[PDB]
């Protein structure tokens, strides 16, 4: 029997998150975590994993700069101070994730969206992730980052090529770059095998207890909590509205912006959030306008 697992999570938001989101931050973080939690409940992962928020902190803490490698190391040694000796104590957490509006930047480019060391979930000193918040898509960056935390590699790594098969495209969470993920199958057979093996070898021992009193994650669709306009505001800023699009609805969110004193449209190529209205009795699901 495949034992159910609970990831008791500390959600930390920073200096820059608070300025951007203001009063709307706590609700926003929960919407994001609700989505991350949903990716992990998908049968593709072939394991029962409940991503549960037990503590949420809004910020004197970690050093947050452009270097992603540096910000991660800082947050990981900081987080450790908020932890507790035993997992009996309702204040203990199994994983820590920081969210920042800071443009996190790797060794070559700034396209980096987050960072985590691989296979650390039950090491309270290493169980760590940082995420660059560029709107609701950050839920996806989070799911990916926790993927790493759960010992998964990218889908183009040598071991994955073998398990994924010669026909595997980049439509999965553990793609090396941001990808449109298969709603029918978010996790590659590689991802499922790596987490499976990771848990069967006892590296998830800290995940067996059920959380004392978890924060209440919303049940609604992200595209209902936040309409197209709010989603544009979340990615590009408060003055940004949805750009009316000719019909490929749901596939890509296009937003307004201002360059030289006239309007223009802008995109990070991310889909409209799940549940966003796209017609009379229709909403976006996985990049498609369904009934
Ligand atoms: C809708 C449902 C299926 C779901 O909730 C869902 C879940 C996840 C998802 O997105 C997939 C996804 C998300 C993020 C990434 C991704 C890709 C690259 C990077 S990165 O920062 O450039 N690389 C870092 C990394 O590999 O983690 C390096 C720098 C350490 C960071 C994140 C790659 C794929 C999309 C949807
Ligand atoms: Ca506990
Ligand atoms: Ca970046
Ligand atoms: Ca636990
Ligand atoms: Zn990665």
UniProtKB/Swiss-Prot annotation:
- Establish whether keyword Metal-binding is in the entry: yes
Q: Which GO terms describe its biological process?
A: defense response to bacterium; extracellular matrix disassembly; extracellular matrix organization; proteoglycan catabolic process; proteolysis; skeletal system development
Q: What tissues is it present in?
A: Expressed in brain, lung and heart. Expressed at very low level in placenta and skeletal muscles. Isoform 2: Detected in osteoarthritic synovium.
* Positions contributing to Zn(2+) binding: 144, 148, 154
- Just give the chief location class: secreted
- Record PTM text: The precursor is cleaved by a furin endopeptidase. Glycosylated. Can be O-fucosylated by POFUT2 on a serine or a threonine residue found within the consensus sequence C1-X(2)-(S/T)-C2-G of the TSP type-1 repeat domains where C1 and C2 are the first and second cysteine residue of the repeat, respectively. Fucosylated repeats can then be further glycosylated by the addition of a beta-1,3-glucose residue by the glucosyltransferase, B3GALTL. Fucosylation mediates the efficient secretion of ADAMTS family members.
Which residues are in the Disintegrin domain? 220-291
- Active-site residues, record numbering mapped to chain: 145
Please report what switches on or represses expression of this protein. Answer: By IL1/interleukin-1.
Write out the entry's keywords from A to Z: Cleavage on pair of basic residues, Disulfide bond, Extracellular matrix, Glycoprotein, Hydrolase, Metal-binding, Metalloprotease, Protease, Secreted, Signal, Zinc, Zymogen
User: Per the record's keyword annotation, is NAD included, yes or no?
Assistant: no
Under Gene Ontology molecular function, one entry of this record is: metallopeptidase activity
Where does this protein reside within or beyond the cell? Secreted, Extracellular space, Extracellular matrix
**What positions does the domain Peptidase M12B occupy?**
5-211
Its cellular-component GO annotations read:
collagen-containing extracellular matrix; extracellular matrix; extracellular region; extracellular space; nuclear speck
The set of disulfide-linked cysteines is: 76-128, 105-110, 122-206, 160-190, 232-255, 243-265, 250-284, 278-289
Instruction: Describe the subunit structure.
Output: Interacts with SRPX2.
Stated role: Cleaves aggrecan, a cartilage proteoglycan, at the '392-Glu-|-Ala-393' site and may be involved in its turnover. Also cleaves COMP. May play an important role in the destruction of aggrecan in arthritic diseases. Could be a critical factor in the exacerbation of neurodegeneration in Alzheimer disease.
Q: What is known of its domains?
A: The spacer domain and the TSP type-1 domains are important for a tight interaction with the extracellular matrix. The spacer domain is also required for cleavage of COMP. The conserved cysteine present in the cysteine-switch motif binds the catalytic zinc ion, thus inhibiting the enzyme. The dissociation of the cysteine from the zinc ion upon the activation-peptide release activates the enzyme.
* Descriptive protein name: A disintegrin and metalloproteinase with thrombospondin motifs 4
Organism, scientific name: Homo sapiens (Human)
Q: What is the lineage of its organism?
A: Eukaryota, Metazoa, Chordata, Craniata, Vertebrata
Q: Which gene encodes it?
A: ADAMTS4
